[model samples]
Target: SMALLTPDDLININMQLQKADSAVQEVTGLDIKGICKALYGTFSSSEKVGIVPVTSGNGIIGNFSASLHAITQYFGFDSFVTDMPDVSGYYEAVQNGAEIILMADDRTFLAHNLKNGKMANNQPCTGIIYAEIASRYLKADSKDVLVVGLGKVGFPGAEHLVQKDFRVYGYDADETLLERATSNLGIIPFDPANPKKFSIIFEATPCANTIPEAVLSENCVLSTPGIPCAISEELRDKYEVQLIAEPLGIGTASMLYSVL
Candidate 1:
């Protein structure tokens, strides 16, 4: 798939910068190179990378595989992704040579500190990127955002939202985690079951058989950065809310091959 640089992809990056929903739109100000460096950070070179993907009985969901492929393309690593049923050994591609073991799924629920800083979860980057995208997704005048779930993924997402200048409210099944998200991350407390709506909603919980479509502001933006996505199309169409359920943070995850 390696082709000569027609440089169309550069246009893609440039176009994304102008996007209202781009995370680096305001901060980086149309500087694709700067935003890429910011999103990617600097990393020690690595030869191989390992990934454990979010999977179900069916197979790997979403465009994650393609997304990962895109990351590998830019970051320059051999990919060894593990998906459903097959597991780490299921894929012939999975390798022990990976210097960085990138957890491709938010289901990991926690961050890992690798000795060389060559292995890490994608939550921090994903959450930050999602929140920034959400800012543009919101109606022109709205800044309030509601985030559901407060696990490792949601908590970071909540924190990142705050960094982006949006007021954040969070809900979680676990009181302990909810308290932690509020106390440590500054995420305000919220109850999803209670009837409430806002201009933006970032959900991290699974929705396939769990929570269904929920109500929201007439013009709301939603970003759910995990598999078993938490947003519903019915809810999306009913209120005509902007939705980002495609694991938008994979762009960050893709850069994570070297930095743990």
Candidate 2:
């Protein structure tokens, strides 16, 4: 019985939390096809899929692709893996075998033409998946939730907690990004070198060891959406920090599941 959760409950939550870790692991490098197959099976031959890299040397352009091929493939859809330099070139993909659309790249998004689509690594923010996962154990109404990071993933995270009425505090090494958090969301500034000042925390940075053991508040719960997890077990025990590892945000994945 720890932090309102029984030992068995902790085991169950641990499984789900591991899912986040594994989910993050699946998207690294060119492991896309293998990870998707392992999780959701092979691509289909019905709906057409287009994997377009926005520009040359575009990084992490396959974040959503594994699922796209997996889902459509399971549903009997055709999927294509090609490099389309621009929007018009996608037509040839259609002529070849286009059904549904899937786009990637850090610079531009072909799926919706949104510029912030390279969420795997290039996007300022990385994981929204953990935000909801984080809220499950933490009380967002009272106390404070500290968000570590201010880029694409971290920035939106501050907003999510704010919208949920949690007193949000933000910290990041990036001066510009930190300024954005303060100016846009009214988040208080913080330094990670010290012990945590708040109880509930959501971390999006890749750095795992930021806070010291001495500073953790009692009954602290830290939900990490970052890969490799930000808080280690040793530190967690030293201060009894409940480490919750949530996966990346599920944007289209949620909708795809709801319908399919």
Candidate 3:
């Protein structure tokens, strides 16, 4: 495991660690330490203890990614493929146990719109999608779920939750559309101001009031689909909520899960 650091440093370090781990696999056949020595001759200083930082686009990204691919190939773990061009491929890769699927969102209009300016299409942050899918494993005995937020993510999350036998109740501030939910899919309309209590609450509303303390209960396991940091500071330390899944990749849910 890596030492805790600020979020940006953590991201850079994780990338570096993957690179170093890959290098260690290339030669010496020993553990990461042996590989570090084989690649750099010696690992004396604290700087060489883990991953070394490098500039972006200075060959580090390509080098690290390539090294990882090579190592995975050498060990027969899985074949390394680069630059998939579609969401279908992304889904297929996860279904096949790809562990980590990297997407390079390149300002494609649809992807950008879906991300709502928080992320671009094919960006590295697409990991959130994988995490969201992985979260299906965390479901308990309940097959009924409610998603509050009728935007881009709310739609998909509702679909996925229902596919798992969860009769989804999608809520939004738009009364016209909220009422239509009942007719469209038999969904229960929840007032953003006064939501019904449920065992599972998936909050996808970008509005700050969506997950207010008044709306959340200790027994409810709330999953915030928006960025948790963007959530009201008063609610930041609430642990009884169970999960705070962030669609932007940095949220209380991911933070707590990583430590646990």
Return the top candidate by TM-score. Answer: 1
Scanning candidate 2 in windows of ten residues, the lowest lDDT window is 1-10
**Candidate 1 to native Cα RMSD, angstroms:** 9.0
Cα-based lDDT for every prediction? 0.54, 0.51, 0.41
Question: Please, what are the lDDT tens digits per residue for candidate 2 over residues 47-114?
Answer: 34555434444333333444444443543445555555446546656566654445544443333212
Better of 1 and 3 by TM-score: 1
Cα TM-score per model: 0.58, 0.57, 0.44
Worst 10 residues of 1 by lDDT: 1-10
Candidate 1 lDDT by residue in tens digits, 106-219: 243222333465444455655655555565552436677777777656777788778777888777778998998888977678866675667777777644423335546675
- Each candidate: RMSD: 9.0, 11.1, 14.9
Model 3 C-alpha lDDT per residue in residues 1-260, reported as the tens digit of each score: 21112344334433544553342233213433342233224332211001122232321233443433433333233334434324555555545544433333212211111112222332212223322432342433454566676555465555555555566767777877666656765666665566554556666554565665655555445555454332454554563445544222222112112211
Model 1 ranges off by over 4 Å: 1-67, 74-119, 136-140, 192-194, 209-215, 247-260
Better of 2 and 3 by lDDT: 2
TM-score of 2: 0.57
lDDT of 2: 0.51
